[PDB]
Amino acid sequence: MLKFMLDTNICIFTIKNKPASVRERFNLNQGKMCISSVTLMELIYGAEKSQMPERNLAVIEGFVSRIDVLDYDAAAATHTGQIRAELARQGRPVGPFDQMIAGHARSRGLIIVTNNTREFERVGGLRTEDWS
Amino acid sequence: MLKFMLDTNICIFTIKNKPASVRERFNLNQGKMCISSVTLMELIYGAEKSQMPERNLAVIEGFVSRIDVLDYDAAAATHTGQIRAELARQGRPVGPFDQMIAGHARSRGLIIVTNNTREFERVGGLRTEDWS
Amino acid sequence: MLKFMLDTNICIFTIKNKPASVRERFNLNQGKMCISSVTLMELIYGAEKSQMPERNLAVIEGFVSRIDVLDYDAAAATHTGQIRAELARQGRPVGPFDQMIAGHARSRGLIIVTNNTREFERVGGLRTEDWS
Amino acid sequence: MLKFMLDTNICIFTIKNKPASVRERFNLNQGKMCISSVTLMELIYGAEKSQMPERNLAVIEGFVSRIDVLDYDAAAATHTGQIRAELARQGRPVGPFDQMIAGHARSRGLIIVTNNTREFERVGGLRTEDWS
Amino acid sequence: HETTVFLSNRSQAVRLPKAVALPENVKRVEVIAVGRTRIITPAGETWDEWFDGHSVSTDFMDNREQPG
Amino acid sequence: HETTVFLSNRSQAVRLPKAVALPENVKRVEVIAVGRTRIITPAGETWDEWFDGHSVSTDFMDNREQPG
Amino acid sequence: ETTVFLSNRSQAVRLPKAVALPENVKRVEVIAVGRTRIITPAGETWDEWFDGHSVSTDFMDNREQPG
Amino acid sequence: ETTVFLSNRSQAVRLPKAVALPENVKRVEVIAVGRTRIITPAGETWDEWFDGHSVSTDFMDNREQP
Ligand code: NA
Ligand code: NA
């Protein structure tokens, strides 16, 4: 079964820097990792606005081919809506895509793997993990 | 088959005012309307932060049970990625949620039903309609 | 995933002339191109009415093997039906095969690659590119 | 198992007139009938350009729900290419939609059901029947 | 006339109250999915319901408009 | 006070093949007769019923707060 | 995930229907890269088609699209 | 009581000696990328990707999440 949702940050990090520490983790957790389609959307945008789109798309393809891209569904949407209202109340600011990614993870009971970890902390009932 | 994707705006407007002109469109097009899960997220958020969360969730379930909710998938994401880059090249300013809805609709050859066609216009490969 | 639908025109253009500019295009976009089965039909007729059916068929089949052929399905048919009517109330004359190809591309949110972009610009919710 | 492919003419005739004799034939041959998506396209078109599109689409949905709609695939495309070439040699003139239907039926070894077998008899390897 | 749905031996099924029960001679049926509705027709009479209602406007494809 | 516990009469029923099975979020259904044919519909998918029904509060989403 | 095996005297890798190849793909190219191998269907490169045989000169001088 | 049958044929790739796999590779993970398939040694699925496949320098220096 799946255990981990890689956030957008750890994906930009990993792809840019190819850190061998992360290479270890991936090899160990192969088959337990996924990303939200929302994050896929960001990576696609990355390549599209870059100097070498076709090239960057191909790197992203090899990454994506190795993991699961989860469809952002009604449960993910519902968790995100609740989460947005919960943070708005408590004046904790979190970015829109991060909100959807957080919602997606929580609705599947997955651990969110981040770079910073700080922003995702403010979300209730969400387990995180730093792989950088 | 599915023909129309109702954007978040037209949904808000429909749920608040339950207008005759829209009712007539809904009947005329029963079975052919969906929303992106991205819009469902927005509606849940609208209810949770609402003064009458209980009541409002309830009207929203009545709405959702009669129209399909499409999961925002990879193809949806890929088009949104592309759309974000197309737009930034042209300094055309469109909201993030609207951009995902636009990408979702374009990936499926769906017509966007909205009451502000003026901003969805900025996207190419996209047909819009104003149900008031 | 697929990105481009090559219409019947660039196919003939490309097959008769083997242009270098187009070769570069295919090398750069290999894997992301397809034709509708409607175009296949045209190509096959082309070879079959040839003066060298034998040889010409063989060339076509070598072109196709390197390209994806999408079946013309109920969605492609529905879009075509819509498009034919859209164009009728505008007096914009497009050919029957071009119309089916347009319908097909729209249903899949594919970009029509052509050289006769003028004929396809009449069609709503469709994106074209000149690859000649 | 599928035995018959209804051409466009027979469908139009049936839909407009609801003839008693055809009702008997359909009831008898239920489960052995289909149309090509090429014919679907024309019917969608028929509705889309009509006085009452949604009314007419509803009737088509009823009709289609009781039969199979075959996708026009490479095999149908290939036979249509051949057929088109065989016909030119004869000088026997046939419409393009009819050619694709003929090709589609032959690729699947189906009997073409129509309301005028004249056209389709100019075509080799093809069995026809008049159900009007 | 309202009614309820039940699984019977690993398969969906539908009660038909007396006021809506099929004639006695209808022993087999053919169920047709038209959108969100299902149509229950006596085997052998699948088209009767469609032939009897469901009229198109009179203009519908008076002209096919196939090119050529 | 005393009375009897009886068995009801068997009801006419119809099985739906998997290919034409209703969705399972559907469990209650309305039925109408047309000739020898019966038409099955999921109850409470009326758009009219929903439009005429309950309202949301007036504050509801006066602002979408979609990030600039 | 599959198990390396042998077939008619040599080494073989099974392809789970999830990641199967199109029924088209009959012959295949193989490249080595570290401990990893890469599979590519043969004859899907464009140069080999462009440089290859050409069509007769009359090919589709007339498209013959009706209307 | 049940009847014994035959499983379906699976798809497989002959692996030439010039390109055969080390002896310590008995478990394999097959990735699909386009019409391309990648055979990796179990537990080493990510090596090939970290090795090649660099993205241009400008690639997402800014994420631009609003
Ligand atoms: Na005609
Ligand atoms: Na806004």
Residue numbers in the entry:
A (entry chain E), B (entry chain C), C (entry chain G), D (entry chain A): 1 to 132
E (entry chain B), F (entry chain D): 1G, 2 to 68
G (entry chain H): 2 to 68
H (entry chain F): 2 to 67
Reproduce the article's own wording on this structure.
Toxin–antitoxin (TA) loci are widespread in prokaryotes and code for an active “toxin” molecule, typically, a translational regulator, and an “antitoxin” that forms a tight complex with the toxin and thus inhibits it. In the largest TA family, vapBC, the VapC toxin contains a PilT N-terminal (PIN) domain, which is a compact ribonuclease domain consisting of an αβ-fold harboring four highly conserved acidic residues required for catalysis. Recently, it was found that VapC (MvpT) from the Gram-negative pathogen Shigella flexneri 2a virulence plasmid pMYSH6000 functions by specifically cleaving initiator tRNAfMet in the anticodon region, thus globally down-regulating translation. In order to understand the activity, mode of inhibition, and DNA-binding properties of the VapBC family, we have determined the crystal structure of the VapBC complex from S. flexneri.
